[PDB]
Write a protein that binds this ligand. Structure first.
Ligand SMILES: CC(=O)SCCNC(=O)CCNC(=O)[C@H](O)C(C)(C)COP(=O)(O)OP(=O)(O)OC[C@H]1O[C@@H](n2cnc3c(N)ncnc32)[C@H](O)[C@@H]1OP(=O)(O)O
Ligand SMILES: CC(=O)SCCNC(=O)CCNC(=O)[C@H](O)C(C)(C)COP(=O)(O)OP(=O)(O)OC[C@H]1O[C@@H](n2cnc3c(N)ncnc32)[C@H](O)[C@@H]1OP(=O)(O)O
Ligand SMILES: CC(C)(COP(=O)(O)OP(=O)(O)OC[C@H]1O[C@@H](n2cnc3c(N)ncnc32)[C@H](O)[C@@H]1OP(=O)(O)O)[C@@H](O)C(=O)NCCC(=O)NCCS
Ligand SMILES: O=S(=O)(O)CCCN1CCN(CCO)CC1
Lengths: 177, 179, 176
């Protein structure tokens, strides 16, 4: 009964793995072998050519342009005034993008409100693995954010930043040629 | 035959649940989080009232959580090496990993050493920011702020703010508690 | 159909959680209570005793030795000329290991090619939570990489490193 369903789900896992290996030389989570990355993206209203893994969470008002790659284990949170992301962006695995915060709410024992502020990222941006972007941040166009960064403030166009907190290292012109 | 019919059925369920979650709760979740409810999972694991935990969270060994605590996606709660306690009104951000064991010696010795173990505790009224890592043996008090991207290697007293890898005390946390 | 399948998937979740809690003292994501970590590893061609969570992604050519533990929320990317990993390694939760990168492709508006370089990790290595290893890196044997690290350069055998970026701290002889 339930054990038949389990056994069938196990068979589907083995077969879908064999399929993903042969056709796309990859092995993916079960969820990612049911759900299609391009269809999910369409269904959420993102630009054509944009893709999003099953493992990604998308909250509230989020806009994404064309040909933007949204990686696995990502967070796109537009619950706090909307998140807007541009075209041709790389949103690496484990990148988290926020428009709200609950620090005061926790530290006050549940009394204080949630803090909220909108966030926007331009086009032709690269957000390295495990980048955290906090609420109220504006990122310009043609920006590189290195892996593991924590972005607490606006970044101008054509900049490379990294660190916790992220600081401006230099321009990103080299990556554009 | 049935393999592909089940796939179709799962695909149809996914489309219907996504469409549903988009209109009611204004969000799109992983397949797993559309079968498994965050509140029911918390209730089942014995957690306090109003506590919630995503399907993607891993809970190993002895783990207890108080009330009104938010356990985020892609989290690790590892009580396997002597018990993990987390208090009430806590924010456990996405990607936060909390441990009571590790395997460094096991690996480095070619599989011969034991797993090392130590219980871990977090108080009430704490905030652990995205991708915070808490290692075995840590005791965190009440009303602590741990900033994003931190690696906490030692006990943190109540009413403190820390961040960094490894985390250091930056100042007290009293200003965050106000009304 | 749809209501029903939903209802049965829920029932199965409750029943599997109950069984995992009693038998292995754990609660796991839905997908990790379908997929067995040792079977998935075997199917992927990994060595005997290796395990990998459902939540892991493996791209391209990836070779993994015996008795290597591959944790949840991991990325093993061998798409840019192969990733090789040795025996008895701990690949903690959140670790991402790459052989490709798309910085130029994004920053050029989709014009530039994907950059590629093979990556290698020896045996008896520990990679701490959320370690990021970039393309082209060679990690020796018996290396410790501390949590929250970004590995941008080679690491010799018997070394301990950590940081973003990762720097050498000392030898790893104490852990052996
Ligand atoms: C439950 C949920 O999901 S909530 C949503 C997810 N959370 C977020 O997006 C918020 C992420 N931010 C954090 O975790 C932050 O570390 C916080 C909010 C906990 C603390 O930040 P605050 O110190 O209040 O912010 P502020 O910008 O005022 O920073 C003050 C100083 O601390 C530094 N700083 C703050 N947090 C960090 C950090 N995590 N690592 C390093 N430095 C930090 C700032 O660079 C600044 O340095 P300065 O004194 O030289 O100016
Ligand atoms: C199978 C598995 O996945 S196991 C479960 C997950 N693993 C864990 O929870 C353990 C995570 N811990 C780590 O990654 C650690 O970096 C370790 C254990 C590999 C190395 O830690 P050790 O160096 O042995 O610990 P110790 O506390 O002695 O640290 C020595 C010094 O280096 C610093 N240090 C240690 N690890 C790090 C790190 N990852 N980043 C920065 N600094 C670090 C300490 O702050 C300390 O500095 P100090 O001399 O100024 O006080
Ligand atoms: C964006 C990125 C490529 C920048 O790296 P880079 O600057 O080209 O590499 P370099 O070593 O030449 O960078 C120069 C300096 O920045 C430092 N650095 C680079 N990226 C850093 C980061 N994310 N955090 C901290 N320091 C960083 C280097 O250590 C070096 O410091 P130095 O002046 O002391 O020598 C890199 O930060 C990154 O995110 N890499 C991850 C790529 C990946 O695997 N992506 C997933 C697949 S799409
Ligand atoms: O872009 S990915 O690296 O994820 C996949 C690599 C090649 N893919 C190109 C896009 N098609 C589908 C486009 O809709 C699948 C194959």
């Amino acid at each position: 009964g339930h054990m038949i369903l389990l056994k069938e789900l196990k068979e589907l896992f083995f077969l879908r793995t064999t399929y993903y290996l042969k056709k796309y030389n990859r092995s993916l989570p079960f969820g990612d072998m049911i759900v299609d990355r391009w269809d999910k993206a369409k269904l959420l209203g993102f630009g054509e050519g944009t893709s999003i893994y099953d493992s990604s969470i998308v909250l509230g008002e989020v806009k994404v342009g064309k040909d933007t790659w949204i990686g696995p284990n990502t967070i796109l949170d537009g619950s706090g005034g909307g998140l807007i992301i541009g075209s041709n962006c790389s949103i690496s695995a484990g990148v988290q993008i926020y428009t709200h915060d609950t620090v005061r709410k926790s530290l006050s024992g549940g009394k204080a409100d949630i803090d909220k502020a909108s966030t926007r990222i331009g086009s032709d941006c690269y957000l390295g693995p495990n980048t955290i972007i906090v609420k109220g941040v504006k990122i310009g166009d043609r920006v590189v954010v290195g892996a593991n960064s924590l972005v607490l403030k606006d970044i101008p166009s054509d900049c490379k930043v990294f660190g916790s907190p992220a600081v401006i290292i230099t321009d990103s012109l080299n990556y554009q040629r």
